[PDB]
């Protein structure tokens, strides 16, 4: 049986959590994340994957630094009190 009896045999994760994105997409044997391309320098992205680009892009996170850049520009990148 290629169905249920063979499904009984799947207990070895081919993917684990990825350091760069916590997506369970890090292929263990290939040592590459199938989602972000880790450990390559460039995050994996394709122009046929517009939904994927939406999921992984600027503004989908906290923007811990980039959120204040517009305010600082609007103020002229001032310094002082």
């Amino acid at each position: 049986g290629k169905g249920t009896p063979s499904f009984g045999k799947r207990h070895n994760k081919s993917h684990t959590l990825c350091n760069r994105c916590g997506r369970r997409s890090f292929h263990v044997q290939k040592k590459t994340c199938s989602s972000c391309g880790y450990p390559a320098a460039k995050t994996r992205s394709y122009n046929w994957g517009a939904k994927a680009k939406r999921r992984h892009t600027t503004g989908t996170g906290r923007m811990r630094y980039l959120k204040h850049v517009s305010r600082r520009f609007k103020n002229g990148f001032q310094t002082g009190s």
Binding site: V69, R72, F77, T79
Partner: protein, 119 residues
């Protein structure tokens, strides 16, 4: 409402360090009480007071380092300006306003004149 930064800023290093230590002791005792008591909102202002003391200490240290590096070039990176990466890489006002001597002579001799026409 906790301590106030304007009255913290006059205090010295030893006094601020002692205040931080006793604030930490009070916070620890308050965590102990919070374990036994349902609502302990005083822990809120105790944590706030610890933060105020820490920021006053840090501001004093950073001002001291700024005074130590005053005047001389090569200030520490955390102390020098932050504007943006590109704003830091851009040519300074002096460097951008630099012109060659040929163009300097040309600009002196033939500037854009102020003229009007009426009749």
């Amino acid at each position: 409402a906790g301590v106030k930064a304007y009255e913290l800023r006059t205090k010295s290093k030893e006094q601020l360090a002692s205040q931080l230590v006793d604030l930490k002791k009070e916070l620890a005792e308050l965590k102990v009480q919070k374990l036994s008591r349902p609502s302990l909102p005083k822990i809120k202002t105790v944590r706030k007071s610890i933060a105020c003391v820490l920021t006053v200490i840090n501001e004093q240290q950073r001002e001291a380092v700024r005074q130590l590096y005053k005047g001389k070039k090569y200030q520490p990176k955390d102390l020098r300006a932050k504007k943006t990466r590109a704003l830091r890489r851009a040519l300074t006002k002096f460097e951008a306003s630099q012109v060659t001597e040929k163009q300097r002579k040309k600009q002196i001799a033939f500037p854009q004149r102020k003229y009007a026409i009426k009749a």
